[PDB]
Amino acid sequence: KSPNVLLQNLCCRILGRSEADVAQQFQYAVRVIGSNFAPTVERDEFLVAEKIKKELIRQRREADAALFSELHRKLHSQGVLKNKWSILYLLLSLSEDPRSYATLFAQALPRDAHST
Amino acid sequence: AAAAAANLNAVRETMDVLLEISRILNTGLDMETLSICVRLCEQGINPEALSSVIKELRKATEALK
Amino acid sequence: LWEAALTYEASKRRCWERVGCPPGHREEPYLTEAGRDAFDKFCRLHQGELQLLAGGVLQAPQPVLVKECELVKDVLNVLIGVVSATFSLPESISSLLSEVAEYGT
Amino acid sequence: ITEAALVRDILYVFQGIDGKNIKMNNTENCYKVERSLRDTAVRLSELGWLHNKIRRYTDQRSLDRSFGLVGQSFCAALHQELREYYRLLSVLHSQLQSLT
Amino acid sequence: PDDRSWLEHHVVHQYWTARPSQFPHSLHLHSNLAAVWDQHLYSSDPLYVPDDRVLVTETQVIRETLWLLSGVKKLFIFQLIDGKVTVRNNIIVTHLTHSCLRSVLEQIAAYGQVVFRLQEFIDEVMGPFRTYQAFMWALYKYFISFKEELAEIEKCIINTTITLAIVVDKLAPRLSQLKVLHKVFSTGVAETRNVVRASHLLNTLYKAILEYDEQTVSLLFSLWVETVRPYLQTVDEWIVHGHLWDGAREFIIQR
Amino acid sequence: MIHELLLALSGYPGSIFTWNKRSGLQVSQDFPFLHPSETSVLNRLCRLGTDYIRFTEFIEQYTGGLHGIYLRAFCTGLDSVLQPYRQALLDLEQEFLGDPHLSISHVNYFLDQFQLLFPSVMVVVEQIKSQKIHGCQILETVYKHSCGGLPPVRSALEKILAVCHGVMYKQLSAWM
């Protein structure tokens, strides 16, 4: 598939409507995703790994934090996920709890100190 | 063929391991929506853009609920 | 495309001879636990054995044909009395076929 | 010398068992490598040194039935915590195949 | 090609027919043990004389074993040394060293010997005694229900991989009732007159019921009824007909 | 290597781990293809299996001298306590067949829980062997040891005691 109709499928998934009932949200999606396509910051899978760890310590789950580390082992045993950093950074950003500073935690380096 | 169905095995496994990772972090995406997002992530795409659009669209299906 | 194909099926048996997530391929049940291919093949091979042990002077071809329903129609009509290429005035079917052909004659 | 041997050895001295190129040359001292990588091991070997004390203690006092209901219930807690540490160690072994 | 391929499929043809094991097998350590042990022997410098046996997989032994335990026997696994079933040590599996294999197959052959002696008893009345003849029908009634369960399990192999340690524990509440009978009938297989050979057979069951006065006890009870069955007939006959006229009798008391 | 092992720890020792009644399940061949330290771990794990082998032999004969209906009621509860040591040997093997990176550490971790249940019941079986305990005084040395100090043997021995008391309600029912 071309990427644009894949963004179209995504906007048909979250919303219950089709793309004959809305064209502003999908145009907003093509506005933001386009010209900011394909990662330009640090993309090691270790950096995002230490932040889902940070989250499961804060939820007081030590069994799930070590269950994850074996789910993290299986991704490395197979090795079929092409961008291991991105889809986990995405799932980390959409996290919510089941139930002062924070910029001194790990942040992906921006890479404007290097011409890329 | 066969080894391309063994590749289908190594993708059907990973699609369940991420499904465990999705529920322990309790993201709102079910397996169908996550299926669009993993194909997007294969092509190379900024999660800092995508999470903003998902947090935008989820803010418009609870505003038009 | 890949998650369309992802929903494929696989066997219950897991290999004791492959490790690394075998999806299995089923060791194929015994020959007396199959039939109407294996039954026909068994009949054909025994018939060919008999032909070799004679020299070709015996001649029983057709390891299949006749099936059940056509023979049942012919035997329903032989009690009226009819001739064909099956009546005149598998291989064990000759034993059952004579006992009910002679009834109609 | 390669890094892989030390990484595979050091995950066993946390149980308190010597590796191949990691040996304990003195009882009082913690686990020693047999240059900077050699220096790194001192902070990691403190864990195996501390582990030996609790493990030896819940070995002896658990099967001491003149040590009372309290003390064997103490051993239960100590042994179960050492168990949850072995849970961690099992994962760390499995994530090999060298890891720093 | 057309008949050999169908044959190669259905009948496995690697442990009763000289043809090595053919499979898309790769085997990683968890089951690759026998090759690993042979390589360990070679690295430890024998030096020569390899270990070569006919090489079966695991699930095949399971199907064979279920068939043995139902009450039919003679397979290509399990050689007889006087008629007692024991491990055929010309067959190796892809794992289990050939020595641990020896132990696990030894336990199941130890179970199979008891079923062999019970089946030879059932055979020795069909080629009457009127007590042995009445005992084999009870033994037969147990074996019918046993064989049905084992045959239905075999169908679910065609539809699933199973190993030896599963089928021993799965069939525990039947092999447990049989182990008690292995102690009771061993004194009931020690046979002058036909009425004392019936009394000594009947009395071991009579004492084994009072010993456990449980699920093996209902087995002993159902077996005891089927050999007090001739005695009730003869005692009724001695009373109401005014005579009992049988050879030396089927009742203990003589006139 | 774990199908020999999860059968060596049960009642099938093999030529590698040599069973003995003075101390069984000892390695007789050091494998160079394994890690050098792992063998020590294995021997520690092997301790558990030695007890399970001895426990089976005592149950194999049963079900004045040591014999009676009491010894066939101790064994009956000993069956039920030993059942999650049979199931936990098959379930691991089911896990191992797909996953290739898994190791001995998982088994050591998971079968650590019976090195508190098994040794505190080992003295109970050894005492009934070493003393002439076949009478009505068997229930005393169960009910004195059932108080325990550890939670597995705290709840285990009561299940065993129930069967022996159920035997004591067959004599005392025909009596009474």
PDB file of C-alpha atoms in Angstrom, chain B residues 4-5 8-9 11-13 15 31 35-36 38-39, chain C residues 1-9 20-23:
ATOM      1  CA  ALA B   4       7.412 -17.232   3.941  1.00  0.00           C
ATOM      2  CA  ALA B   5       4.715 -18.881   6.049  1.00  0.00           C
ATOM      3  CA  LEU B   8       4.106 -15.389   8.785  1.00  0.00           C
ATOM      4  CA  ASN B   9       4.676 -17.363  12.002  1.00  0.00           C
ATOM      5  CA  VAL B  11       4.967 -12.012  12.518  1.00  0.00           C
ATOM      6  CA  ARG B  12       1.886 -13.642  14.110  1.00  0.00           C
ATOM      7  CA  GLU B  13       3.951 -14.209  17.283  1.00  0.00           C
ATOM      8  CA  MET B  15       1.677  -9.303  16.890  1.00  0.00           C
ATOM      9  CA  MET B  31      -5.628  -5.175  17.568  1.00  0.00           C
ATOM     10  CA  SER B  35      -2.577  -3.352  12.829  1.00  0.00           C
ATOM     11  CA  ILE B  36      -2.624  -0.060  10.940  1.00  0.00           C
ATOM     12  CA  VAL B  38       2.514  -1.450  12.841  1.00  0.00           C
ATOM     13  CA  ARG B  39       2.364  -1.191   9.027  1.00  0.00           C
TER      14      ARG B  39
ATOM     15  CA  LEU C   1      -1.553  -7.508   3.524  1.00  0.00           C
ATOM     16  CA  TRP C   2       0.691  -9.091   6.152  1.00  0.00           C
ATOM     17  CA  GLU C   3      -1.939  -8.918   8.891  1.00  0.00           C
ATOM     18  CA  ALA C   4      -4.519 -10.086   6.389  1.00  0.00           C
ATOM     19  CA  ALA C   5      -2.346 -13.172   5.871  1.00  0.00           C
ATOM     20  CA  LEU C   6      -1.489 -13.285   9.602  1.00  0.00           C
ATOM     21  CA  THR C   7      -4.815 -14.975  10.476  1.00  0.00           C
ATOM     22  CA  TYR C   8      -3.785 -18.273   8.799  1.00  0.00           C
ATOM     23  CA  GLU C   9      -4.226 -21.698  10.460  1.00  0.00           C
ATOM     24  CA  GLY C  20      12.080 -22.926  17.300  1.00  0.00           C
ATOM     25  CA  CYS C  21       8.250 -22.803  17.235  1.00  0.00           C
ATOM     26  CA  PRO C  22       7.321 -25.728  14.974  1.00  0.00           C
ATOM     27  CA  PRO C  23       3.839 -25.224  13.532  1.00  0.00           C
TER      28      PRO C  23
END
